[PDB]
């Protein structure tokens, strides 16, 4: 039951369902102590039974319970764990992650099959913890706290930060993803090449695997962190290593519309 | 009494409690029919239950009466002024002891909580709870600075003498315990409650000297 911002409280529906059960349970105790007739007691027990059902699963038996002045059914324990929006499919089988970005994709024909164009401003945020250590190592900043304060303001970023950022990402790879990911080649590892702009440059030969054209599509960027994550990406998931289709075994990164026309 | 926070069956059960009390007090000598006297108790119980059980954040019965009276007054003025009254009009109509400030405070008390599962959007795919950050647990950035500071401070205290570092840690609560008063520390070392102050103040100066000559401990001051 939080205090949003600095005004108004926000509460879950489980509080309302618990309160109803406690109110009816306490009332039943009072009625029993007063020797009320059987008609009154029988009604109270039936209400108490219905209060438990709504708390455990609202709607299974009878009309769903809704909050005052609303027709939106309360969220019970069962509804929390079930459905496309439940705990299993929303927070356990998939999650939101840190060190991730997104931006529009444009075609880069000068890239090699294992390279991609990553904007400088995206790389600065994605690789921030690595960059701060590099700045401290050199003379750019006195310590990590001072280094972090420097990057907060856009006009306080010196030109040596871009040189240090170039050292940090040396050899590393990032994972590019375009939704929907219908096969495994919808997530591939590329070697970033810092570029001026705000759009990601994608190699022409990997467009068919991603099923991505350049009419306004977008892609997500993820950064493996540890050596095990980096080793797997640079060995198994690299774009230049997956050339044949797992489904049929035929080439999947092959000449396309304009390349075929010229040859 | 329906449509006031409590369901129809809840009102009936609250009424039944009032009806049981009426049978206890009803005096048949007076020659008044039962419904004449029993109606008072039934209404009282259905009205008391609403005040005690109609809100997630409970409000005292006396405050509930004040809020309802404020709503009555602020609605009579609306149709009388042909517009929504300002807080000054409501306060003046209420009577003595009421000002514009109090009217606003009473209205900030009568604000119900907003559910965390109210959808936002045409589809039932987004909710309020998806947009409320957690500001209690320390963030990874804040945790790192706390550990870094302890590491830098620990080395700084390594330049001092062994007892002075223990004096500062004890007096400053670096041992996870509240700051032990000079005396309490004096009993720890069996010395006066003034000697601890003299060494503690002296050592605190030397730490000041080193930081100025190194400036390796100022970025943590925020």
């Amino acid at each position: 039951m939080v205090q949003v911002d600095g005004g108004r409280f926000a509460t879950s529906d489980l509080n309302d369902l618990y309160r109803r059960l406690i109110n009816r349970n306490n009332r039943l105790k009072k009625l029993l102590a007063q020797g009320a007739p059987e008609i009154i007691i029988r009604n109270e027990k039936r209400m108490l039974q219905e209060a438990v059902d709504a708390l455990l699963d609202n709607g299974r038996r009878g009309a769903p319970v809704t909050n005052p002045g609303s027709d939106r059914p309360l969220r019970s324990l069962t509804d929390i764990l079930s459905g496309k929006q439940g705990r299993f499919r929303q927070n356990l089988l998939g999650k939101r992650v840190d060190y991730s970005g997104r931006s529009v994709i444009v075609v880069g024909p000068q890239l090699k099959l294992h390279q991609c164009g990553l904007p400088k401003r995206m790389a600065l945020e994605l690789f921030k913890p690595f960059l701060l250590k590099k700045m401290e190592e050199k003379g750019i900043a006195p310590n990590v706290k001072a280094a972090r304060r420097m990057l907060e303001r856009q006009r306080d970023i010196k030109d040596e930060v871009w040189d240090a950022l170039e050292e940090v990402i040396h050899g590393k790879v990032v994972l590019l993803n375009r939704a929907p990911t219908l096969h495994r080649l919808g997530i591939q590892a590329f070697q970033p090449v810092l570029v001026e702009g705000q759009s990601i440059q994608l190699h022409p030969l990997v467009c068919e695997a991603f099923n991505a054209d350049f009419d306004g599509d977008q892609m997500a960027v993820h950064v493996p962190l540890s050596s095990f994550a980096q080793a797997e990406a640079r060995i198994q998931m690299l774009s230049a290593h997956n050339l044949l289709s797992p489904a049929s075994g035929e080439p999947l990164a092959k000449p396309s519309r304009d390349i075929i026309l010229g040859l | 009494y329906t449509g006031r926070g409590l369901s129809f069956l809840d009102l009936i059960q609250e009424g039944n409690q009032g009806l049981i009390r009426a049978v206890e007090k009803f005096e048949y000598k007076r020659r008044f029919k039962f419904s004449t006297y029993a109606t008072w108790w039934i209404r009282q119980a259905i009205n008391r239950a609403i005040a005690d059980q109609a809100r997630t954040i409970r409000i005292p019965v006396h405050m509930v009466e004040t809020i309802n009276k404020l709503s009555r007054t602020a609605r009579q003025l609306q149709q009388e002024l042909g517009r929504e009254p300002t807080y000054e009009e409501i306060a003046e109509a209420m009577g003595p002891g009421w000002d514009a400030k109090r009217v606003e405070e009473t209205l900030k008390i009568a604000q119900e909580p907003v559910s965390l599962e109210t959808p936002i959007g045409d589809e039932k795919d987004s909710f309020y709870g998806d947009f409320i950050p957690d500001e209690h647990l320390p963030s990874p950035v804040d945790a790192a600075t706390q550990s870094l500071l302890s590491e830098e401070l620990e080395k700084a205290l390594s330049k001092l003498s062994e007892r002075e570092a223990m004096v500062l840690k004890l007096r400053k609560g670096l041992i996870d315990g509240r700051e032990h008063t000079l005396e309490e520390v004096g009993a720890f070392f069996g010395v006066t409650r003034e000697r601890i102050r003299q060494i503690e103040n002296k050592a605190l100066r030397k730490l000041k000297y080193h930081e100025s000559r190194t400036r390796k401990l100022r970025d943590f001051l925020d």
């Binding site: 008609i39 029988r42 009604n43 039936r46 009878g62 | 129809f8 069956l9 009936i12």
Partner: peptide, 14 residues
């Protein structure tokens, strides 16, 4: 049966 209010009203009418 499925309506608690309908069921209660019938009970008190006896």
């Amino acid at each position: 049966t499925s309506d608690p209010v309908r069921q209660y009203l019938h009970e008190i009418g006896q």
